[PDB]
Amino acid sequence: ITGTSTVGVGRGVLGDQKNINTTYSTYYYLQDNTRGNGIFTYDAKYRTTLPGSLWADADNQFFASYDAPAVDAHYYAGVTYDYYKNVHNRLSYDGNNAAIRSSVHYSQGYNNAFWNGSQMVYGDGDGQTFIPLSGGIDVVAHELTHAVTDYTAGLIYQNESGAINEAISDIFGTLVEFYANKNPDWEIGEDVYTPGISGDSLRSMSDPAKYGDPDHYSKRYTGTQDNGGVHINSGIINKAAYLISQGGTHYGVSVVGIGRDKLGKIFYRALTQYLTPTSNFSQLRAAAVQSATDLYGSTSQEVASVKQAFDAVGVK
Numbered sequence: 001i002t003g004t005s006t007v008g009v010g011r012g013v014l015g016d017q018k019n020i021n022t023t024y025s026t027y028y029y030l031q032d033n034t035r036g037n038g039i040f041t042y043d044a045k046y047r048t049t050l051p052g053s054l055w056a057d058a059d060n061q062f063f064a065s066y067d068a069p070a071v072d073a074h075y076y077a078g079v080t081y082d083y084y085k086n087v088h089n090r091l092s093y094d095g096n097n098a099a100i101r102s103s104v105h106y107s108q109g110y111n112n113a114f115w116n117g118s119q120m121v122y123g124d125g126d127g128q129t130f131i132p133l134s135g136g137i138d139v140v141a142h143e144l145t146h147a148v149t150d151y152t153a154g155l156i157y158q159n160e161s162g163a164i165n166e167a168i169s170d171i172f173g174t175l176v177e178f179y180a181n182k183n184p185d186w187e188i189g190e191d192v193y194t195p196g197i198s199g200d201s202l203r204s205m206s207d208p209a210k211y212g213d214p215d216h217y218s219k220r221y222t223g224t225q226d227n228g229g230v231h232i233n234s235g236i237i238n239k240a241a242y243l244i245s246q247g248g249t250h251y252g253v254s255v256v257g258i259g260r261d262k263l264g265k266i267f268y269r270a271l272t273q274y275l276t277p278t279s280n281f282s283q284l285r286a287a288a289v290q291s292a293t294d295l296y297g298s299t300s301q302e303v304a305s306v307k308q309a310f311d312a313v314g315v316k
């Protein structure tokens with residue numbers, strides 16, 4: 001909408017106070033004009049019709065319980081925008097400053113979040129498995145990274161290409177979490193998962209087997225569940241990415257860690273310059289190797305570490 005840019009204040013899902021960019025025209029809307037062609041946050045009002053209504057507030061104060069998922073969806077979309085712009089020189093998810101749209105309060109008791117081809121969508125959770133899912137910066141950045149992938153590599157959401165798609169979202173979700181530097185880790189969704197249980201999450205990149213996911217190609221899931229295992233077999237790639245960044249010895253194969261910044265550079269270049277819609281794990285290895293070669297040279301430690309990491313998870 002047309003109005004003047006304002007700065008509201010509110011609390012997120014976890015009770016943390018933060019400022020949010022809003023727009024004033026009779027009401028204060030969750031419309032951030034400071035980034036690209038805008039970040040827009042919507043209320044789905046417990047329905048499944050999307051996007052719902054652009055979030056309107058009478059006084060530019062967002063401290064109600066009902067406000068908190070919208071505060072975080074809006075704020076963390078901004079952090080993610082900043083990450084891609086400042087770290088990768090990418091302007092929004094399409095590289096041309098597309099407006100970023102998110103809806104919160106989707107459905108009732110909805111224990112998930114997703115990118116629907118056009119926008120982000122966040123459930124509130126059922127209060128037991130999840131609290132409102134926009135409270136997790138890695139969740140927000142995971143979903144927005146699906147938009148990046150869909151506008152670049154276009155990895156089909158099935159089988160090995162779908163597991164790469166999922167792993168890319170976990171990788172950059174985690175790198176945004178580290179970028180924001182609030183309780184960063186290599187787990188996915190811990191801030192909004194199971195409020196009665198400390199230390200758990202949906203997935204672990206450092207140890208996928210913690211939650212039953214494979215950490216080696218020999219353990220890949222080959223059934224039909226989960227679109228051929230896209231959230232399961234992502235663990236094989238998540239582990240390789242963790243090893244590239246942090247190093248370690250995995251099934252007797254030692255990897256020299258090269259750090260998160262270089263991990264991000266290698267995988268961003270693979271995603272945007274080498275992967276295609278049908279890329280499989282072996283083709284991802286080749287893409288990461290050639291990406292690291294482009295950036296650092298064929299004899300570099302960076303290339304050697306990419307090779308060791310994919311060796312360690314059984315991907316030739």
Ligand SMILES: N[C@@H](CCCC[NH3+])C(=O)O
Nearest residue numbers: 111112113130202226231
């Ligand atoms: N996002 C993953 C994990 C489940 C989220 C909670 N039910 C999936 O859709 O399978």
Ligand SMILES: [Ca+2]
Nearest residue numbers: 057059061062
């Ligand atoms: Ca208010």
Ligand SMILES: [Ca+2]
Nearest residue numbers: 182183184185
């Ligand atoms: Ca964390």
Ligand SMILES: [Ca+2]
Nearest residue numbers: 138187188189
């Ligand atoms: Ca995390």
Ligand SMILES: [Ca+2]
Nearest residue numbers: 193194195197
């Ligand atoms: Ca928990």
Ligand code: NA
Nearest residue numbers: 202211212213
């Ligand atoms: Na699991």
Ligand SMILES: [Zn+2]
Nearest residue numbers: 142146166169
């Ligand atoms: Zn995903």
Ligand SMILES: [Zn+2]
Nearest residue numbers: 114166230231
């Ligand atoms: Zn998914």
